[PDB]
């Protein structure tokens, strides 16, 4: 297993057809889970599974610049369970990343970080037993 927060560096950045996997079980009594897919300091995308937002469980994706969070998208499909394995995966498309989890279709984010070869790692953190994670052309 992997420890969390766990950093998957994506060499030479992201680029349309790459496929992120990831392999996980949420742990008891889960608040969240977070991937950031990072520029620098920066964060393209953010999604952000929160499993009590004012008893609601949401996921909410952004974008952060200069260290300001921008406009949140938010998502009230929610597919993950509180102590229940997982997968994520995360195709780059040419205008968005595009989320499936446990074989569903999910949502897409329109990309706000255009130099996508500069999103260079992505951070996988939160309430969760971390299994794998990975990257595979398709
Ligand atoms: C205005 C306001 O209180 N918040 C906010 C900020 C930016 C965008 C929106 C919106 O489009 O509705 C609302 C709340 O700001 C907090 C603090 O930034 C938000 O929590 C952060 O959310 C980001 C993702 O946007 C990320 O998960 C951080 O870890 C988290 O602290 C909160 O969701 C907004 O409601």
């Not at 004012?54 to 994706?61: A, D, S």
């Not at 989890?101 to 969760?128: F, M, P």
Request: with cysteine.
């Amino acid at each position: 297993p992997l420890i969390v927060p766990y950093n998957l560096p994506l060499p030479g950045g992201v680029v349309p057809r790459m496929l992120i996997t990831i392999l996980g079980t949420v742990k008891p009594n889960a608040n969240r889970i977070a991937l950031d897919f990072q520029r620098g300091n920066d964060v393209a995308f953010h999604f952000n599974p929160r499993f009590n937002e004012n008893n609601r469980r949401v996921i909410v994706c952004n974008t952060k610049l200069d260290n300001n969070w921008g406009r949140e998208e938010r998502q009230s499909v929610f597919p993950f369970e509180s102590g229940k394995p997982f997968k994520i995966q995360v195709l780059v498309e040419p205008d968005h990343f595009k989320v499936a989890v446990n074989d569903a279709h999910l949502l897409q984010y329109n990309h706000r970080v255009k130099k996508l070869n500069e999103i260079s790692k992505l951070g996988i953190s939160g309430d969760i037993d971390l299994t794998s994670a990975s990257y595979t052309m398709i």
